[PDB]
Design a protein around this ligand. Structure first.
Ligand SMILES: [Zn+2]
Ligand SMILES: [Zn+2]
Length: 52
């Protein structure tokens, strides 16, 4: 693996106040597909389209 530094807990569900540890989760994230502006802002934090 080239990413041994995984993020703690799932961020999709913390947006609402969830903490599952993201261990074998994602599909288990009640927010796995949420769309609120805190779940989109999250996926946005990881993706990078412009640098400053
Ligand atoms: Zn989650
Ligand atoms: Zn959300």
């Amino acid at each position: 693996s080239i990413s041994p530094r995984t993020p703690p807990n799932c961020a999709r569900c913390r947006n609402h106040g969830l903490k599952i540890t993201l261990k074998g989760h994602k599909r288990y994230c009640k927010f796995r597909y949420c769309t609120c502006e805190k779940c989109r802002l999250t996926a946005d934090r990881q993706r990078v389209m412009a640098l400053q």
